[PDB]
Amino acid sequence: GNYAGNFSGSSRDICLDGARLRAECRRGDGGYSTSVIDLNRYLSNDNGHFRWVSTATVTVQQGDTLRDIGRRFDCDFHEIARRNNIQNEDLIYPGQVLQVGGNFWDSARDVRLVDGGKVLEAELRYSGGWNRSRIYLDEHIGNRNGELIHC
Ligand X SMILES: CC(=O)N[C@@H]1[C@@H](O)[C@H](O[C@@H]2O[C@H](CO)[C@@H](O[C@@H]3O[C@H](CO)[C@@H](O)[C@H](O)[C@H]3NC(C)=O)[C@H](O)[C@H]2NC(C)=O)[C@@H](CO)O[C@H]1O
Name the residues that contact ligand X, by CB under 6 A: 60, 62-67, 77, 89-94
Shortest reach from residue 53's CB to ligand X, in Å: 18
Q: Pick between residue 73 and residue 77 the one whose CB is nearest to ligand X.
A: 77
Q: Pick between residue 1 and residue 63 the one whose CB is nearest to ligand X.
A: 63
Shortest reach from residue 126's CB to ligand X, in Å: 17
How many residues are recorded in the chain?
151
Q: Pick between residue 16 and residue 86 the one whose CB is nearest to ligand X.
A: 86
Shortest reach from residue 59's CB to ligand X, in Å: 11
